[PDB]
Design a protein around this ligand. Structure first.
Ligand SMILES: O=C(c1ccc(-n2nnc3cccnc32)cc1)N(c1ncccc1Cl)[C@@H]1CCCNC1
Ligand SMILES: [Mg+2]
Ligand SMILES: [Mg+2]
Ligand SMILES: [Mg+2]
Ligand SMILES: [Mg+2]
Ligand SMILES: [Mg+2]
Lengths: 147, 187, 103, 157
RNA sequence: GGCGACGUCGGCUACCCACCCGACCCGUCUUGAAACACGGACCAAGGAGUCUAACACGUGCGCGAGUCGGGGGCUCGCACGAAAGCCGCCGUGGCGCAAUGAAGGUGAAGGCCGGCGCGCUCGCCGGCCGAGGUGGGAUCCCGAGGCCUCUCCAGUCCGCCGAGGGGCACCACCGGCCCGUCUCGCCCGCCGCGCCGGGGAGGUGGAGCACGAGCGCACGUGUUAGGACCCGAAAGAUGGU
RNA sequence: GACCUGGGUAUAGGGGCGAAAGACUAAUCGAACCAUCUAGUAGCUGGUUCCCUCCGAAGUUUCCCUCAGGAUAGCUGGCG
RNA sequence: UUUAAAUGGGUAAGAAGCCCGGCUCGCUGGCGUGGAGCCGGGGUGGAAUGCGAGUGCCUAGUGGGCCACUUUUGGUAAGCAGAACUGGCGCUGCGGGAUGAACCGAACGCCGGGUUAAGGCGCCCGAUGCCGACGCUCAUCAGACCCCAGAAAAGGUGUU
RNA sequence: AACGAGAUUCCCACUGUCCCUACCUACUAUCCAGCGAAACCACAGCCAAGGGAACGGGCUUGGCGGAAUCAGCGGGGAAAG
RNA sequence: GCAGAAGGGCAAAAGCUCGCUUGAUCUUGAUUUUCAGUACGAAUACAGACCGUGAAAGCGGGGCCUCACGAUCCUUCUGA
RNA sequence: AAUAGGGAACGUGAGCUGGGUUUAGACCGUCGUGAGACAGGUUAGUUUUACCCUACUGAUGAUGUGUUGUUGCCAUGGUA
């Protein structure tokens, strides 16, 4: 919207908002990232520490399918199921435990996080962290691995 | 002449809200009628939070609310929050707290009303309490955004903790000199 | 030219790109063109089915996707043999046949 | 240009002024500094091992760390655009106690027992100290004798 | 209270003139312009901070631990329809919800009580809970006491309320926890006893956790890359007369 | 006379040709002309079009093949 | 260099304190030690004077400066080259200095009244057109208001 | 030796190079008849001193000033290209 | 006299001789110095290891102190 | 008689002259491997416009005095 912007507001002022003295020309400090080593050093650093050099090993042709582990930590674990069951599987009779398999929801790994409630659970996942399964084997629940 | 000040004489705060929301303009006109007539402060704190921007009215989650109301002295009071209440899922059980806010979400107002709560907006609050007596006023974590963790001293000097802007968090992106002493120097 | 805190940038514009631009001012006009290429092909052939033949059941081949099931290309060539139908009447029955497939 | 060096403008200010050379007197080591004792810095020149910088010869700080032979002090070094709370590890010789807080610590302590002394006496004693008041109308005596006239002397070389 | 027409009364414009005082010619570089510094005879019209992408931040709107149909598909053969509407066993997918490590990989909860194995700085068990504490912290709650045509009989109230309690956001600190290395150390587990896994306590490195706040869209500002605010070379290169 | 002159033909741009001056090659030569790549790059000069209201500076630090420029801080404004 | 000024710089002038009482500790160790830590309890008026302060964000312009008293360095010296403190012009008119960037006043919406600042009061030119007061000085080159725009050594029975 | 629109010095003859200028003719210039451009141009045009970006035309203070003009003129316009 | 340029410092000593000797060793951080309040360099106090000396308290991680030196990429060697 | 010293954008180029300097040709000497350099030397080398205003020198003039003419006086300005 050309009304609201500045070049209507600054139409009549002779130097048009770029100084009488520097008088903005075309490219005074080199084009793009020019001089990251030499004269824009103080600006390339302090604001980008780490920018210059090798850091790691090469992995030629990495495939973005085998580092694929989407992760639920346990506080999102009861909301994969209908909440009509977690009240139903909490009726005082027995250890009526439902399965909660993350691998039909898009997750492969159960990471640890505190505050799981006090119902008995069985969880099918491909990967468990040792904080996570002791957060399940402390509520009277079990941890069934499958792939 | 008078002095040699550098001017802060023009205050810079909000006085009329920049949104053209005609429903918020019917809540400014209610409260700045009640701000200067209450001879108290709870309106004059609500009246300036209806001015504030979209960022400075952060989304207060449900579980911050039901934790700050379990303190000794907040047992049956009606919690007021300027901003939107979004529900959390990390908590399991929701009591029958009574709240009063703009724009509770669709899932939260199920979970409040099914457990027997009551939600309000700022027009059935005035009839209940012109003073706003017996409430707790809440606000969300206004420094919770990912913007505020870019902000610190400078992402280069000692004790930085500033999260410098890269286009992809990964290897060979800002990790070579400035981060480890074996290559170049360490901040 | 770099200033206070920001993003280092690599835009790929140093190559001359004002000749190889492809505006999509016809992406409606192709959708109304390839519905006519179906509607005058759905009635053109037959009460034979549109949307092609019967396609197989195929599981996706990576660690990322092997939990879900995809429509594939063709019956491998022993399903034609187990179900007992000749391999060159199968594509005029209306079943799609993929010759090089393993099972 | 001007040789940005440690120990530069210190021909006179890191040296014992006079007739005070030799080893240090041993009362400088038998001082007790605690976390919070306000101290100043006067660097000696016989103990080469910890003397702060010529910015700090004469600036008064406050202890935050004590070690087996040094004392961590936080001070305020004026930089160009602002000041900085800076922390310096100074040896034990290069400082001394600051007597700049004695005439607060004694005048609070005769404002404690002198508060409760006037509390059981029944008054409004006005313990707060006042600045030097203007001279109230005094009264002089010219006992017997009369004032001696004086007048400017003539010029001589 | 007073004075007065057929030519008079008021009033000025982008009007002329006379007078007094003031007044060097404008754009520009510059510490410095009226300059003996440069451009400018006059007049009309044209004539210069754009667009696309990317980002950052502020604001506005919708939804909100999610959000987004941008690409295809559906509707009759509709001008305005290259629109609009819908899809959801069209969510594939983007970005966010999970960080650290070179990499294999690993991946974020403590609290209170009681009972104990030399309670031995090590440690073992059940229970209740559940995001730890310190100091500030708007607001809200209790509030001794006071305040009305006569003193004793009571009601919703109001206003001033000393002190005290709970404490949002945040700010500083102390603790905790996750990952990378380092010092010290003893224990356990068995798809099978090994140059095997798991753990501990201290000290550091991390763009982390400590009840999540993001995505989409629009607008402004700024920076970059594109002819990039308009105008400007000596050149260079291919292909020809 | 190592003379002057008409027409025909030959030699073409890093090349022709020169009794030698870097002369001559269509008024163009210490590298011709025409067209495109190309609106080539410019830390450099020239310009940069409406009004009011509010605030209103800087020529210094550190570093750079930096000294006619840029980065960083300083100083300014807008938003809260 | 014994001494050692003026100006200058640092700190301090309370509850974030002070006192008493009690528990941790792997540190320290004759010693219920020392020192930190924490918990509870006690008392707000602690130099003057002035004022509302704190904190976050994004970022334009600038990176060629000069002048003045004062203190200084090179230089014979400069409207010269280089500094320190602070003010000023640049960005700023107006009154005065005849005229001027920078001096002396003084800072600006548009106006009507009154008064002063620095300065001036023969006439240009507003104001001494006062019976202004006291002394000096005569030039055949008189003298005549900071910066400031013409001067010395030396000399005179020119005159006090 | 010869030769040279080659360069330098002297001598003889000669002469307006000069002492020292003067006169005469032709074609202009000049004026009329007819036809009639460009260069250039902020505004324009008298001077002295002062200050000023240190050498003005325009400001200050002075000196002063008459229409419109022709033939010349080369001091100035720090002229014009 | 303290190796060398000066300034400061030093007397049962920081000097001069003697006797042992490897702390000129491994390791993680904090801070100071020019600073933009980056980096190299230098320096300061510490902490964990192993040692030296001394009878001992101690002192000692180079020179009595203020200078004696150098990134990314690349090469080389060593370490579990 | 005297052959005093000076200034006026180092008076004076739309007044002239080009001798030197100061372009391009060329020769020698010294320096340089070389291209070339040389307040060392020599020779050869295009000098543009006034018609604008002003200044000035001349020439008609102009106002004011009724038109007009003759004879005159002189404020001033030049100077031998
Ligand atoms: O004709 C000219 C002539 C003279 C002046 C200009 N100028 N100068 N500035 C000028 C600006 C605009 C127009 N012309 C201009 C042009 C040419 N000649 C000439 N004279 C001397 C040197 C050079 C030359 Cl070419 C010839 C040569 C032989 C003798 N006969 C005359
Ligand atoms: Mg700008
Ligand atoms: Mg500029
Ligand atoms: Mg001008
Ligand atoms: Mg070419
Ligand atoms: Mg006469």
């Amino acid at each position: 919207p050309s009304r609201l912007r500045k070049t209507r507001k600054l139409r009549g002022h002779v130097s048009h908002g770029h100084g009488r003295i520097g008088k903005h020309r075309k490219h005074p400090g080199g084009r793009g990232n020019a001089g990251g080593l030499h004269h824009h050093r103080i600006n390339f650093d302090k604001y980008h520490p780490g920018y210059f050099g090798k850091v790691g090993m090469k992995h030629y042709h990495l495939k973005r399918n085998q580092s694929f582990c989407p992760t639920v930590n346990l506080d999102k674990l009861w909301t994969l199921v209908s909440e009509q069951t977690r009240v139903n599987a909490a009726k005082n009779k027995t250890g009526a435990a439902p399965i909660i398999d993350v691998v039909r929801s898009g997750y492969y790994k159960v990471l640890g996080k505190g505050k799981l409630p006090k119902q008995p659970v069985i969880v099918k996942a491909k990967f468990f962290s040792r904080r996570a399964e002791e957060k399940i084997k402390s509520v009277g629940g079990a941890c069934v691995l499958v792939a | 002449g008078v002095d040699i000040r550098h001017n802060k004489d023009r205050k810079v705060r909000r006085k009329e809200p920049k949104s053209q929301d005609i429903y918020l303009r019917l809540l400014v006109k209610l409260y700045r009628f009640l701000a200067r007539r209450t001879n108290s402060t709870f309106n004059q704190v609500v009246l300036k939070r209806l001015f504030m921007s979209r960022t400075n009215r952060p989304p207060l989650s449900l579980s911050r609310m039901i934790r700050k109301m379990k303190l000794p002295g907040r047992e049956n009071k009606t919690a007021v929050v300027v901003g939107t209440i979004t529900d959390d899922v990390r908590v399991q059980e929701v009591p029958k707290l009574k709240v009063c806010a703009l724009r509770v979400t669709s899932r939260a107002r199920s979970r409040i009303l099914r457990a027997g709560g009551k939600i309000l907006t700022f027009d059935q609050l005035a009839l209940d309490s012109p003073k706003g007596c017996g409430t707790v006023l809440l606000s969300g974590p206004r420094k919770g955004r990912e913007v505020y963790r870019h902000f610190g001293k400078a992402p280069g000097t000692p004790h930085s903790h500033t999260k410098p802007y890269v286009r992809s968090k990964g290897r060979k992106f800002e990790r070579a000199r400035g981060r480890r002493a074996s290559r170049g120097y360490k901040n | 030219a770099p200033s206070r805190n920001g993003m280092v940038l690599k835009p790929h514009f140093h190559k001359d790109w004002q000749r190889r631009v492809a505006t999509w001012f016809n992406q409606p006009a192709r959708k109304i063109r390839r519905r006519k290429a179906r509607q005058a092909k759905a009635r053109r052939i037959a009460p034979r089915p549109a949307s092609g033949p019967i396609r197989p059941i195929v599981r996706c081949p990576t660690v990322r996707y092997h939990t879900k099931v995809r429509a594939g290309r063709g019956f491998s060539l022993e399903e034609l043999r187990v179900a007992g139908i000749h391999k060159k009447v199968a594509r005029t029955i209306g079943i799609s046949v993929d010759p090089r497939r393993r099972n | 240009t001007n040789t940005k060096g440690k120990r530069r403008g210190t021909r006179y200010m890191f040296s014992r002024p006079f007739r005070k050379h030799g080893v240090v007197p041993l009362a400088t080591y038998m001082r007790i500094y605690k976390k919070g004792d306000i101290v100043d810095i006067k660097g000696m020149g016989t103990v080469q091992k910890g003397m702060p910088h010529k910015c700090y010869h004469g600036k008064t700080g406050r202890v935050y760390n004590v070690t087996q032979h040094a004392v961590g002090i936080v001070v305020n070094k004026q930089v160009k655009g602002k000041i900085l709370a800076k922390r310096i590890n100074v040896r034990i010789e290069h400082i001394k106690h600051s007597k700049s807080r004695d005439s607060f610590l004694k005048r609070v302590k005769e404002n404690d027992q002198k508060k409760k002394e006037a509390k059981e006496k029944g008054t409004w004693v006005q313990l707060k100290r006042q600045p030097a008041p203007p001279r109230e109308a005094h009264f002089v005596r010219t006992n017997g004798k009369e004032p001696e006239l004086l007048e400017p002397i003539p010029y001589e070389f």
